């Protein structure tokens, strides 16, 4: 704290607000700038609910939350920590999305950082404008593929901010070790091009090779400035350019795809909580997926690896996996184009080629259902009455976002099929109660769940480089976290009310293997794991600005 | 002040060295950044003493006196009252000329403001480049009449600099309310055109009326900053420019000539005292100048204004004044030009027509004598013993600066006239005892006994101009503070040891004065004009830099 | 750089005086602030020289000197780059000795960071107190033996602001990135602790375990606020202290003792090019050290393991080695104690005891003569005309600092010998022509020629810990550089002229040596490593302040 007077207040790092003890008023310089009167954290919380309350719409609701990231970072986390069960779904999907559609109308103030094709050659003194100095997680965007809502373009900055917010209301990571960013090279969506409010570049995506170089002069600058295992979340970018940067940089820096293999491991782990009540034998499993992406891909391999630590030969785990997409079936020769990821996949056609998503679950009959179109309630009834009489107990989830793109709804799933589904969705949804008494707490299959508690591991433990075991290894530890008295409720997940924990124990696990696989390089090594881990968490708690003074002998 | 850390200890505004207190250091973060030993003024100013005595020249000891102005300022000003007489002839004349003519080599960090004629129309923004906002004297000049080493161009900004000490030093005037400034439009200096050291523009002096508009934006930009009634002294430029610029500007802001007007009140003062050893008739009264330029006129003019006061017409006094410069004795219908303001002095030819300065005497046969010519030893010993014979107490003054082109020094002054003579020169010289024992200390006829009161009066009383009279009640207010005592030892000016209560004296007579004539803004009028005076003058002791801490009931 | 105006000018890490550019003046606020003209960096050094050659003592020059440093970084070390060899007896040995004994009579401003043990407790907020936040390389000093001065206490803080100049100066190492430290305990020095002009605590030295606890306490703060591979060069401390923290540190920390190691790997290297004209007969090598401490025992392990790599048993190689201290020769059952370290160079006493010096040389008739007393001239004329008749060509080597403790001279040395000797000197000596016209050119055996290299490799390499062979290593590393034409004028070492590049071809040989000996954590790692190292080399000239504009298509 080299700074005194009004600039502390109007720093929200430090801005205390009325908790600003007199003793910091009178040596800071601040006495006379602040009310008479000195609040406890705990009646600033009381303040915040109290006006909450009495709000009515959502979107209202996440533009007061989110400006008091604007005003006191310290509240700003100590009330999402209060209740960010409830609070969730307001500065996550699906209001999230909302948001971001409305960027440019709701603006007040910006956050992260900026980078434009049109400053390519000057990223460097860009990332040198940026005031934290020691950041450690960055979450980076380019607004191609906003949740299922597509081109957002710049308005799709309210991504990377609200995942960050996560990584310190989840994992504890430092607020100022986090840096969101977003790399404007335009935006192909009409409408905003046409939008007078837009926040971007006025011009359509620029994809030829200057788009490459500038990623390329944007990773390199980072890492100047930062460190060479500074982490890097990729986040909603196009799907050709997710695993085309994910392989090309993934073994040069500390970087990996949140959308490929942070769904892999929360998807894994639902799954793995379902077998404990199916205990159906793995040659009898297939899976049939609804779209065949960034996701979709991305669950099947780790799927897959993990059928294979099973057993199973990685080819007969492949032939067991199925993907649908908006061209229809992947089956070898037709005419719509297979990619590299894709192959594995991509099996000799049926008998009968299906149609309609009915006819596949019809016609190949999977035991699991996975939505990952991001095209909206796809999972029609007499898809889920199909699944409903081809399993006893089938396995349906739905994880496009936000709700609206949802393939379909708890509600839906649970008396669709008489509650004898396992569900898990990626938006909320709330408990089910059938017309006979039965009540269905689903769970909710999102990354949230991963990536605060894995990007913790990964920097304390100063990781160089990401494989897909340690989402694997995430994946079984976030699961390994269930209770059968929650899976006796229909939660394949444990309580949203308990990501925190949940997340600590997740990084706790993955630090054990980094350093069991001698991936960590923080030295020396610790003898207990878990002590290390809590010891560094951020806390809410204001801390005393107070200067040192003592009396010499 | 509003700043903590290093940067205190950077800036010599508030610098304390050792001397800052552990309670500062640790409440503004400075611990570590100092030695474990706390010192107190004194004993910095006992590391100066100790210091300065081992050096063995007096541009050595310019040097390292003027650097600790840019590192501790209040250590600075208390190491110059701690003998300020001792330390004069090496800040002030003659050293401080030395220092100018060598600016260029001995430069280590620059000092006021610089503005070149390459910034005419920007002149503005250069006077908000100022740090200090809050100024209330400048002290300008352009390099033209460095002392009698003429054109220095930039390298004159050290008499800028030194003369902004003297207000501090000698009045009280606070240090951060000053602003040295330099107007660079060029120099015609053809040895400082070749030096690689030069400091300003290399080009030849611009005399076009951009030269003019130059000076008005400058005093435009500065008044619209900091106010209308701003002090201006002029100092040190060309003839021309001299009286040009203070007629233009004297009535619309509040600005004077040093060299004109200030120089006027030290000479008149030396020559009442002086009068009161002889008690010459006023009828009687004949004087003669060395030189008719800025100083000449300027004395001549205050002589009158007091002649007249004591019952003489203006017309007549004049008469009583003659002058002789690089041309000849100014009489009426001569080759060489006469001016505007010579014109009063400027008589019919005498029965003969001096060729040298000492056929003047002999013809005019004169009381006094005053050498102002800036050219070096003109009173010449048969000069001296020429004004010997012709008086029985002549009146020698030789002004100019520095000591090598004053007119002749104490010991020929003294020593030739057998201790008869009336002596006071510019720069300093010691006591002479001549052969038959008898020790004659002279006085110095020097503005710095009258700049630095006059200023500090009319900047209290918030004057917005400066007429004549002010000058003639300073002259009438130093002079009225010699003792016989001092007066018996050869001196017509109180001792220099005394400068810095002799000028708040002068500073207390002068504010009177303003105020009983209309002329102080100030409001309200202080009662007890002295109490008020001494209340505000700056302290060399420093001052405690702790935050207001105290307990609430 | 964050800041503008003033600022930039008051900050000598930013400082470029009239160097600073139009553009930059103008767009940085300081337009007007510095006068008309625009000077190069190389005009600048022309007005250094010019002043420099007017000085007369070396005091002098050295106040001179380091006072830029405190105005204008850049300046300073291109003054420096400009002539390391003659400026170097002024800014290190033997005139930073008598600098620091006189630390108190010639201070101005403070430099380094200062820790004293009535600061425990809170030695964190003293180093959060530093301004450079990414500090890499601290030396640190209590003071205790400050050459072979002895206790200076906080008067001995001009050391580590030295070594530290030499980082830059000699392996451009950058000046933001090293922390000079000084551990106030208290002073034994009785003449200091009645001086009022002393630094530090007024009292006697605390050995109590509150003694090591501050150590621990300041090793801990360090290597927390600015990492735990940070390099922390202890100096001059006593001897106990000094093998003490080396041991107890060099396996938790990135240290290393230079008075120790670094002296090694120097009188190895001098050593070494010695015996390229000797070829003496391994088995036929006695080596007789005056005075058994810190350095003594250094260079003896080090020469022990060049013998033991070149065949002889750790055993055999000891027993060529003999000490003689301040008691007498160490033999085996003598009353003065031996200590740990000794043991190995105890041996069995021989038929008769040597009582002086020359004795020991009369009776054991060693090869080599090794000074390190740090007690002015004891290797006698007796000794040097000993050696002389014993050897062929005897080694002698005088390597206490300053020079008025040095063993003996170089004009002694080669003329006491008739020039048959191989001699190297811890201070400067100038060359020697005898009567009979031979010349010889002497050699410095100091470890500047080492830690400024093996510093830099330590710091780009992320090397975590010290061992000895580095210096092994780095001690071959620059013998490797002599060329026979300069052994042919009596040089054991490279040329003074030369100390950058041959720092620079160290620290590429130590690099080289880490990555292949698994001890470099840089990552990843580099092909060409000497391209690697000459990459990253700080330089004086100034770099552009301008900021990044341009248009937008
Ligand atoms: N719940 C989570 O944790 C999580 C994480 C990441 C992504 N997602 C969601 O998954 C969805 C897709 O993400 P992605 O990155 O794989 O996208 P993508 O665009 O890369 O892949 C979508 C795939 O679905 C197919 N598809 C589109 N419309 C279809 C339709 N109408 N019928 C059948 N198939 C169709 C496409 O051809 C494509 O192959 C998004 O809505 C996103 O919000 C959820
Ligand atoms: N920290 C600050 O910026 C600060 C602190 C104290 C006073 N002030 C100024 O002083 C004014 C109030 O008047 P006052 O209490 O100074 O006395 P005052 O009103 O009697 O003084 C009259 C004028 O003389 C000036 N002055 C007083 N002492 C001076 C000195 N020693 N050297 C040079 N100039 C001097 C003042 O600035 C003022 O404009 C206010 O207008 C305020 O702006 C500013
Ligand atoms: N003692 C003080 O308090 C004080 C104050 C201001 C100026 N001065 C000194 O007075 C001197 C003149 O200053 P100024 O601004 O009036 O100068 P100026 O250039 O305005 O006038 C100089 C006059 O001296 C005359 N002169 C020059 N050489 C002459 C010579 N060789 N013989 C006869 N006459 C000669 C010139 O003709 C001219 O009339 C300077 O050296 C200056 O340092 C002293
Ligand atoms: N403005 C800044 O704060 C800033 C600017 C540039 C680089 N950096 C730092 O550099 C690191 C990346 O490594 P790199 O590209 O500098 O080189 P590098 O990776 O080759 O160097 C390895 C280590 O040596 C250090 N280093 C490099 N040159 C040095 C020198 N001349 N003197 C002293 N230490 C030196 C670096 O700090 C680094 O920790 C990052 O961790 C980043 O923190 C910081
Ligand atoms: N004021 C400061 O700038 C400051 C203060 C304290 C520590 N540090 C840094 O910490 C390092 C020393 O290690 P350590 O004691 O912090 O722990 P550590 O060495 O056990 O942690 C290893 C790495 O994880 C990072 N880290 C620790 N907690 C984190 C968190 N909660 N969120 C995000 N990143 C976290 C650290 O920066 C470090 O690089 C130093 O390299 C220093 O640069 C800086
Ligand atoms: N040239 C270099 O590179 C370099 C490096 C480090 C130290 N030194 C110098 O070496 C000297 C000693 O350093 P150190 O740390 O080893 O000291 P130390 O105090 O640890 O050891 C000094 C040894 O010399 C002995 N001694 C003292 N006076 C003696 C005397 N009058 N006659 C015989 N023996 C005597 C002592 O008993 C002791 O064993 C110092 O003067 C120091 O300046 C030079
Ligand atoms: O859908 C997205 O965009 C995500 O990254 C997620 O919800 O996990
Ligand atoms: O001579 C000068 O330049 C003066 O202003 C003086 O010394 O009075
Ligand atoms: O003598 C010392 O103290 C040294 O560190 C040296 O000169 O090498
Ligand atoms: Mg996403
Ligand atoms: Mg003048
Ligand atoms: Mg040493």
Not at 127 to 133: C, L, S
Not at 191 to 220: N, S, W
Not at 357 to 367: G, M, R, T, Y
């Amino acid at each position: 704290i080299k700074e005194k007077g009004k600039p502390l207040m109007l720093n929200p790092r430090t801005n205390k607000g009325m908790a600003f003890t007199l003793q910091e008023r009178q040596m800071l310089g601040l006495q006379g700038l602040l009310p008479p009167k000195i609040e406890t954290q705990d009646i600033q919380a009381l303040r915040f609910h109290r006006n909450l309350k009495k709000m009515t719409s959502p979107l209202e609701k996440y533009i007061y939350i989110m400006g008091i990231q604007e005003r006191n970072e310290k509240l700003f986390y100590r009330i999402l920590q209060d209740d960010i069960e409830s609070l969730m779904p307001i500065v996550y999907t699906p209001t999230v999305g909302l948001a971001c559609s409305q960027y440019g109308h709701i603006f007040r103030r910006p956050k992260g950082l900026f980078i434009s094709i049109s400053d390519r050659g000057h990223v460097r003194s860009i990332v040198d404008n940026w005031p934290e100095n020691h950041v450690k997680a960055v979450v980076v965007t380019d607004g191609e593929r906003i949740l299922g809502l597509g081109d957002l373009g710049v308005y799709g900055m309210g991504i990377p901010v609200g995942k960050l917010c996560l990584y310190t209301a989840c994992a504890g990571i430092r607020p100022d070790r986090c840096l969101p960013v977003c790399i404007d090279v335009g935006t192909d969506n009409i409408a905003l091009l046409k939008d007078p409010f837009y926040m971007g570049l006025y011009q359509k995506r620029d994809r030829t090779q200057q788009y490459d170089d500038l990623i390329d002069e944007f990773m390199k600058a980072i890492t100047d400035r930062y460190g060479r295992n500074t982490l890097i979340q990729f986040e909603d970018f196009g799907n050709h350019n997710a695993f085309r940067f994910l392989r090309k940089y993934r073994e040069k820096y500390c970087t990996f795809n949140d959308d490929i293999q942070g769904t892999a491991a929360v998807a894994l782990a639902g799954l793995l909580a379902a077998q404990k009540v199916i205990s159906k034998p793995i040659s009898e499993h297939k899976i049939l997926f609804l779209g065949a992406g960034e996701a979709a891909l991305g669950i099947a391999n780790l799927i897959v690896m993990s059928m294979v630590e099973n057993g199973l030969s990685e080819q007969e785990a492949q032939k067991k996996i199925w993907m649908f997409d908006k061209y229809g079936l992947l089956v070898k020769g037709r005419k719509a184009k297979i990619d590299s990821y894709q192959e594995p996949f991509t099996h000799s056609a049926p008998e009968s080629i299906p149609d309609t998503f009915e006819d596949a679950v019809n016609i190949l009959k999977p035991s699991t259902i996975i939505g990952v179109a991001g095209a909206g309630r796809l999972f029609t009834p007499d898809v889920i009455r199909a699944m409903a009489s081809i399993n006893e107990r089938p396995v349906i989830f739905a994880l496009s976002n936000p709700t609206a793109q949802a393939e379909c709804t708890a509600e839906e799933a649970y008396t669709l099929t008489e509650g004898r589904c396992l569900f898990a969705s990626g938006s909320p949804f709330g408990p089910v109660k059938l017309t006979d008494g039965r009540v269905f707490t689903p769970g909710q299959g999102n990354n949230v769940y991963i990536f605060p508690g894995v990007a913790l591991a990964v920097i304390l433990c100063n990781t160089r480089h990401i494989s897909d075991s340690v989402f694997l290894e995430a994946a079984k530890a976030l699961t390994s976290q269930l209770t059968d008295e929650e899976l006796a409720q229909g939660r394949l997940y444990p309580p949203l009310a308990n990501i925190q924990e949940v997340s600590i124990n997740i990084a706790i696990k993955v630090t054990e293997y980094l350093y069991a696989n001698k991936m960590a390089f923080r030295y020396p090594e610790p003898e207990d794991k878990a002590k290390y881990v809590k010891e560094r968490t951020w806390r809410s708690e204001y801390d005393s600005l107070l200067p040192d003074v003592y009396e010499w002998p």
